[PDB]
Design a protein around this ligand. Structure first.
Ligand SMILES: O=C(O)c1ccc(-c2ccc(Cl)cc2O)cc1NS(=O)(=O)c1ccc(-c2ccccc2)cc1
Ligand SMILES: [Cl-]
Lengths: 233, 242
């Protein structure tokens, strides 16, 4: 009866979670920090122990993990970071609020992007103010040309998260290590879709809560034995 | 030089405020020790330092110092490796005692022996010690062999178990070109410095690394220092550390 815990980070600075924060390395707001604090509170109240932690290379998820480890007195745990758990790359939309997105591209196209599993936003181009900030960031210097996205469909995001799940996380779960994953809405979507065998439409309707420990109980073949559970009140 | 290595010793802990022996007890930083780490991280940020991998102990006063530095230099994304081999010296039965309790129980002559000696350990931490289960039964040491888990350590013991991690895990990374940052403790960092500089027992026992201060080594391809250690900081802070 393996136990797996996911946590999605909370609010980022400057309202960037409502501005397609994407691969821009926005920090948590103080409220998002408090969210992570309460999630860690909940994990420690329930007496949870972990053996290894996985997170992205984005500081809002890393800081969520740090806050949780602090609260549960497990800062000594091994931590593994990977770009494959990063948030979806929103291309040229990154940093724009909803009104600006609709102004620039029109409501028809925005609705198409919102409802599509496999259509990416426009690429982030050199005139985008985040272009060099993300694409030339040292943390991605080992990625090959086709690994570093200029934009991602949801299909793309899940396609680059799942090799990490299969290759690095699954072997740990199968050895009995109690895994904690602190990551982002869409990378965690990829994991949940793989675990529950959800359809494209279903995963696109799934909106995981933030700051809340999400608990899975898996059988020998890593199939959930019951619906995902939340920790708290 | 071919390579650059940076060390940082954590600052004041909650038990330092109580003048208690921590050793392997997992005391957190005091607010002032946290502020020390922030200033060291700021010094690394001002100097434009970049790292590729970080090593630390399994003790939160060192881990939190690393976290604080990584935050300051905006390199929170770096790989981090934790190891018990970088832990503070294990003070055995003295763990949890303060200065007065130690002097009262053991006397001046014995305490001077322990202070001055390279290879005489303090008394062992026995099963009835108040922190025995808290430390020796902590699941973070579950994979240590029976001989690896200390009941007490002389400085020679501490250095003897830190240096295998240096040789087997850190040296290969440096020679692979990785820019290493080590955030650890006075006595485990003493082990590294003694090896790097070929210092005597006498010399390493007289070395007190400053806390919260980035310590910079410029190393040739054989990991031999090309010059004495450098301290990073403003004129004032670097002068206090001489
Ligand atoms: O100064 C400290 O309190 C001290 C505290 C801890 C240690 C110490 C202990 C164990 C280890 Cl493994 C490492 C250490 O560094 C050394 C100290 N300094 S001392 O020069 O040796 C000294 C120790 C006792 C006394 C004394 C005793 C009884 C009645 C009156 C006076 C006077 C001087
Ligand atoms: Cl970490």
């Amino acid at each position: 009866a393996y136990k797996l815990v996911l946590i999605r980070h909370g609010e980022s600075a400057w309202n960037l979670e409502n501005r397609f924060s994407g691969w821009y390395d926005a920090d948590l707001s103080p409220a998002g920090h408090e969210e992570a604090k309460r999630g860690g509170q909940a994990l420690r109240d329930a007496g949870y122990e972990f053996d290894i932690c996985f997170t992205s290379v984005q500081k809002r998820a890393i800081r969520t993990l740090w806050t949780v480890l602090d609260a549960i007195d497990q800062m000594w745990l091994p931590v593994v970071r990977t770009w494959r758990l990063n948030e979806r790359h929103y291309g040229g939309l990154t940093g724009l609020n909803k009104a600006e997105t609709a102004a620039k591209h029109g409501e028809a196209q925005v609705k198409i992007w919102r409802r599509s599993y496999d259509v990416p936003p426009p690429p982030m181009e050199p005139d985008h103010p985040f272009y060099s900030n993300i694409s030339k960031d040292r943390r991605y210097a080992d990625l090959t040309e086709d690994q570093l996205p200029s934009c991602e469909s949801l299909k793309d995001t899940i396609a680059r998260a799942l090799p990490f799940w299969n290759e690095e996380i699954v072997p740990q779960i199968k050895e009995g290590k109690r895994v904690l994953i602190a990551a982002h809405g869409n990378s965690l979507r990829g994991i949940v879709k793989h675990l529950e065998g959800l359809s494209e439409e279903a995963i696109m309707e799934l909106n995981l809560p933030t700051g809340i420990p999400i608990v899975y109980e898996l059988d020998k073949n890593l199939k959930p034995i019951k619906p995902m559970q939340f920790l708290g009140d």
